[PDB]
Ligand binder design. Structure first.
Ligand code: HEM
Length: 399
């Protein structure tokens, strides 16, 4: 059994193993860092099955849960939030914060999302690039999602820049372990003060709704409100930054699709759909243990065995998406959902928000900067390390 996680074939590519597995051994065992085995599921139909089967559990205290690193094993000891819950606990807690993220709520947030993108783009223009390239990640891909989720949580405008930097430090490849852990606990300490403040005087933000609707009636405690707020911050922010940067690189890589998007910004939603299929920035979250025996394809997954369902692989499944390794914004979509945001009851709470942020970015960026260019050769883009989820660390641009 091969070691898992697998490394990407190159900067912008999935691991090479998945295509071969889909063709010749779609449900197979892999070896995790601790020597334990897990079942790896690679076909779209089977990933959806894993995502939805009530015979499977997300609870990390079940033996056989496929932790992929030493750090994950240690994080499993903590009081879980809804990301690691099964029904009925899962929706009992998730429903406390889903209102801000519904399709209708996100449609009403569109003018705010647009303003945030417009202001950061105008910022960038004022900075200018007269003295040379600027980093699109630091100047734009990082602050767009950061400012939005912090604002929705309740952070005031003057604190956004500092906290945006600190949250980046938590996941920056270059941070030492100490630096990332200090940033982590710093964010937590900050959120704990906001919860104290919003309990005494609520405002129009997610933390206030938690305080008023859940903490004060005793449904959860202050510490739970902090952890829920924290989960909303850290679960998706790095994914958003990576998807923005990857989208700019992808357009540069396929000039006539960029030309189409510039000529017709109304194409941004379909560009974003293709982007979230082709670049599956979160490929390791659909994990389970079997509560009881379950058959998947030609395999028996026994009780207390772990399962990893690769949505990245599913998004390249030739049986579902014709010419899956082709980036095509004009893709003819099948009835089966792309799985960039997962599937089933745990499907990304923020899927609609994330797509709206991305659509806003890709319908505005090249109207603002029609001559935006990556300022290094595309082959020299600094991607995340190959043993991680796909992403971009920094992206020099001119405009
Ligand atoms: C493009 C950006 C994003 C991508 C690709 C992404 C992807 C995902 C995926 C693959 C999952 C796993 C879903 C499953 O278990 O089937 C997930 C879960 C989740 N995401 Fe996102 N996400 C993004 C942005 C966000 C944002 C902006 C937030 C918060 C504001 C967020 C919050 C969450 C939460 C809380 C979960 C756990 C849901 C649950 O288990 O019930 N995500 N996301």
């Amino acid at each position: 059994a091969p070691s898992f996680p697998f490394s990407r074939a190159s900067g912008p590519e999935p691991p090479a193993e998945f295509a071969k597995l889909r063709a010749t051994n779609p449900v197979s065992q892999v070896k995790l860092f601790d020597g334990s085995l897990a079942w790896l599921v690679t076909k779209h139909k089977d990933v959806c099955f894993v995502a939805t089967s009530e015979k499977l559990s997300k609870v990390r205290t079940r033996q056989g849960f496929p932790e992929l690193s030493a750090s994950g094993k240690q994080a499993a000891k903590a009081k879980p939030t809804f990301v690691d819950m099964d029904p009925p606990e899962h929706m009992h807690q998730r429903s406390m914060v889903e209102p801000t993220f519904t399709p209708e709520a996100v449609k009403n947030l569109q003018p705010y999302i647009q303003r945030t993108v417009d202001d950061l783009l105008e910022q960038m223009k004022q900075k200018g690039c007269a003295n040379g390239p600027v980093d699109l990640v630091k100047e734009f891909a990082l602050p767009v999602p950061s400012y939005i989720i912090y604002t929705l949580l309740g952070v005031p405008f003057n604190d956004l820049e500092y906290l945006t930097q600190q949250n980046a430090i938590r996941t920056n490849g270059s941070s030492t372990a100490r630096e990332a852990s200090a940033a982590n606990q710093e964010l937590l300490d900050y959120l704990a003060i906001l919860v104290e403040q919003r309990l005494v005087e609520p405002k129009d933000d997610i933390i206030s709704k938690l305080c008023t609707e859940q903490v004060k009636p005793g449904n959860i405690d202050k510490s739970d409100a902090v952890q829920i707020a924290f989960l909303l911050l850290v679960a998706g922010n790095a994914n958003m930054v990576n998807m923005i940067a990857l989208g700019v690189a992808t357009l540069a890589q396929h000039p006539d699709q960029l030309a189409q998007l510039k000529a017709n910004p109304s194409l941004a939603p379909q560009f974003v759909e293709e982007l979230c299929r082709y670049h599956t920035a979160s490929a390791l979250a659909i994990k389970r243990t079997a509560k009881e025996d379950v058959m998947i394809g030609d395999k028996l997954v026994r009780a207390n065995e772990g399962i990893i369902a690769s949505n990245q692989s599913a998004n390249r499944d030739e049986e579902v998406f014709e010419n899956p390794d082709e980036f095509n914004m004009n893709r003819k979509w099948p009835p089966q959902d792309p799985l960039g945001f997962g599937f089933g009851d745990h499907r990304c709470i923020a899927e609609h928000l994330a797509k709206a942020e991305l659509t806003t970015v890709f319908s505005t960026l090249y109207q603002k900067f029609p001559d935006l260019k990556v300022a290094v050769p595309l082959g020299k883009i600094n991607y995340t390390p190959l043993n991680r989820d796909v992403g971009i660390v920094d992206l020099p641009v001119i405009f």
